[PDB]
């Protein structure tokens, strides 16, 4: 089997991407944030504290003939930005782009933190990191991908995020028309439950490539590119007027600037992030100070190849017995 679904930016900045997901019988379609940095499939629901729902589409398990309460199971998750959600668990039929999993753990939110409430466009998350990070207790649950894997033509999914445009998540096959050149594969460590890999270095604009190992995670659920302070400083030094602002919480730059590209290494190959991808617009409405798309990972404790990086590539999440990551230009 295979699946193929379009993923769409939630706003003009590509702050996140939503992908339609069919849950239950009859189908209830929710727009979920596919997140290769976490491993819970959770949804706004009929059980969500009413004051914490503001425009999201909710899953109502009582209206699904295939929903079954997973007795005793609870979940609770905290994300790197300080947001959180928690609740109980159903199993139900979940389909993505024509690909169907029966008995998928659907984590029903009883509580969500303010940033989820305040984002009316995201109805939940669909985790695609390794199932070892799944927060369901006392019986940990498998991701959608993990459940689908055996049925897939090939045990892979691919992320093809658009810049200011829709893209595609495919399951079970590699669309050879979706990228240019060849796919370069690179080793993955699953020891932290992430799609963790080592970039071979970077360049800023037309500058020379610096060969240096950068361990990080391929994370579709993170907006920006978080890299070591040395790297990030070298990037923003090429932008006149750019500075790190503690009050804003990162590098800002004059909105009048033309940003240089940023290249990262995948083995001997190179992925080029165009400068425009690194502009996340005024820090506040009407401001001429713009927020940078490359930020320091210092104090996060991990480097994160988020959407800014991933949207410059066709990315293969290879879930073979020994997982690997593939990157191609596109």
Curated annotation (Swiss-Prot):
Active site positions, chain numbering: 35, 199
Domain named Peptidase A1: residues: 17-328
Keywords, comma-separated and alphabetical: Aspartyl protease, Disulfide bond, Hydrolase, Protease, Signal, Zymogen
Catalytic activity as recorded in UniProt: Hydrolysis of proteins with specificity similar to that of pepsin A, prefers hydrophobic residues at P1 and P1', but does not cleave 14-Ala-|-Leu-15 in the B chain of insulin or Z-Glu-Tyr. Clots milk
GO MF terms, alphabetically ordered: aspartic-type endopeptidase activity
Record-level GO BP terms: proteolysis
EC number, UniProt record: 3.4.23.22
Disulfide bridge partners, by residue number: 255-290
Family to which this protein belongs: Belongs to the peptidase A1 family.
Protein's UniProt name: Endothiapepsin
The encoding gene: EAPA
Shown stretch of the complete protein: 90 to 419 of 419
